[PDB]
Structure 1
Amino acid sequence: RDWSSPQQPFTIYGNTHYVGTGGISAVLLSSPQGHILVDGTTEKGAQVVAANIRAMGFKLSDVKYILSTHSHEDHAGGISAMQKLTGATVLAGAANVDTLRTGVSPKSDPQFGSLSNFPGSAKVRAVADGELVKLGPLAVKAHATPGHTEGGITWTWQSCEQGKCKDVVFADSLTAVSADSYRFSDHPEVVASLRGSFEAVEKLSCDIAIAAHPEVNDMWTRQQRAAKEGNSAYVDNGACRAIAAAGRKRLETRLASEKR
């Protein structure tokens, strides 16, 4: 379950398919009129995502949008390659656009000093909080979830099977992590952003959460359950509340650790 590792793709519900690596989520939201890809995994992982999309019976040329959660190498490293293979437009939160274009995270990022660069992408455009991305019958909503990065987006949609529908959430990372030289307690905008994001995410309509790091919502345990349970194993309408609570716990632990 390395970030770049092969992983046999699988349908989670309706037209929502996991096409990521062993260690990093990527989702294809499919339609007869074209598809939306969420995240690219790593640079090496792009080749896994591409093969996975084809294994699910889809053409790369039919991927029209690539949606980015946030601009670190593990989620976004593969986007550039996937952009070239598909012709898609890359959509991201406003403050991460420049990072996706250059592959270099800026000094506002808590991890600045400790991050690895990744390949810059073409055709990057911004989306706002609450904005709808539409493609044929697909409708994906952008939710600003800053803190881990300034331009983090959590993406939501509905997938259905014979008219039985579920609210799906591709959850951005909400984690307080930094370089050794960074003090969260000195950066009130980042702390406030994280806290606002926990609150947004714990309020989302959230039947199926797919976390950018899949183990955050126990993807592999759930997949194992699904072998007998079916795809109800991925359903848990508390999952976004739990991802938010774990974010909050990580930040509170960190702020306590920083006290003089």
Structure 2
Amino acid sequence: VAMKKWTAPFEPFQLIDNIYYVGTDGIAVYVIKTSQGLILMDTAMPQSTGMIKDNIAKLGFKVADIKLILNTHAHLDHTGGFAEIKKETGAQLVAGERDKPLLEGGYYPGDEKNEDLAFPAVKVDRAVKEGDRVTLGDTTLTAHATPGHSPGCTSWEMTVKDGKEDREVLFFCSGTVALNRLVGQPTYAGIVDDYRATFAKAKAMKIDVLLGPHPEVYGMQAKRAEMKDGAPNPFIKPGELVTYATSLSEDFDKQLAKQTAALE
């Protein structure tokens, strides 16, 4: 999948207000335009960095203007371009504190010898905790600790305009089980409790626009196809995070049961 949908092209676009989609057909990456430079939200696979840089350019944004790189979570499909872009731009990397060891080592937790899941190691300039505010110029994002998919998985909240009114955006960090081990030798200590706390947290947030590190988190392609001038922004769907977190919780139960049965 990493060399299929995850590397397939998608045309960059203005998603809402100062948030621009610059990812691929299978990995979501965002530029947030501020009055004092750009924030880059995530990157893609290590081999896709040039592609992401080209997408930023298609919008007329300058890679050189990136001041901050923020991470949702520290897996190679989101961190693959951090070392390269950080060195090129002098940007600072901001990430959840418990993902710092993963970022700085370039490894998958609980599977550290797996070179196919490695990525170029990168230093974290600011390690964030719940409620920390990251500001560049006119723009502030708030960190929310939503661990499970990774130990330092961070969901980022910010306010945008839709016409004259405020709308709340969440870059949800991911809540899938994916490659993680939940029992036996869990991927990290306390993983199960983290996931279940995160589903509850997500369902309690008041979020107008759900975003995520893969477009399938929020059905990006269907919304993009419906978008046009003089029609409501299809990315505004305030009920979506509750619905999505409910689906994630149901799949989590299925995987926990499957992995528990496999222990025998």
TM over 0.5: yes
Q: 1:231 to 1:34 in 2, by over 3 A?
A: farther
- What amino acid sits opposite 1:210 in the alignment? L
Residue 22 of structure 1: aligned partner: 25
CA contact (8 A) 2:182 2:192 kept: no
> 244-253 vs 43-52, which deviates more?
43-52
Mapping of 1:178-189 within 5 angstroms? 178=179, 182-184=181-183, 187=186, 189=190
Is 1:208 the equivalent of 2:206? Answer: no
Residue 34 (structure 1) aligned to one of 24, 34, 37: 37
- What amino acid sits opposite 1:60 in the alignment? V
C-alpha distance in 2, partners of 1:211/1:250? Answer: 17
Deviation (angstroms), 1:106: 2.9
Residue 150 of structure 1: aligned partner: 151
C-alpha distance in 1, partners of 2:27/2:253? Answer: 25
C-alpha distance in 2, partners of 1:132/1:20? Answer: 25
- Say which SS state the counterpart of residue 82 (structure 1) adopts: helix
Q: 1:4 to 1:82 in 2, by over 3 A?
A: farther
Question: How many correspondences in the alignment?
Answer: 255
- Say which SS state the counterpart of residue 147 (structure 1) adopts: coil
- What amino acid sits opposite 2:89 in the alignment? T
Which segments of 5 or more consecutive residues in structure 2 lack a partner in the other structure?
none
CA contact (8 A) 2:182 2:191 kept: no
Residue 237 of structure 2: aligned partner: 236
CA contact (8 A) 1:112 1:178 kept: no
C-alpha distance in 2, partners of 1:255/1:159? Answer: 37
C-alpha distance in 1, partners of 2:184/2:107? Answer: 24
RMSD: 2.2
C-alpha distance in 1, partners of 2:233/2:162? Answer: 12
Q: 1:144 to 1:228 in 2, by over 3 A?
A: same
Q: Which runs of 4+ in 1 moved over 3 A?
A: 111-115, 185-188, 227-231
Residue 128 of structure 2: aligned partner: 127
1:22-73 Cα distance to aligned partner (Å, 9 max, x none)? 2101111102311111101111222122112222222222211111111111
Residue 7 of structure 2: aligned partner: 4
CA contact (8 A) 1:5 1:45 kept: no
1:195-249 Cα distance to aligned partner (Å, 9 max, x none)? 1111111122211111211112111111112147746211110111122112201
Deviation (angstroms), 1:255: 2.3
CA contact (8 A) 1:77 1:119 kept: yes
Which segments of 5 or more consecutive residues in structure 1 lack a partner in the other structure?
none
- Provide the identity percentage: 30
- Say which SS state the counterpart of residue 34 (structure 2) adopts: coil
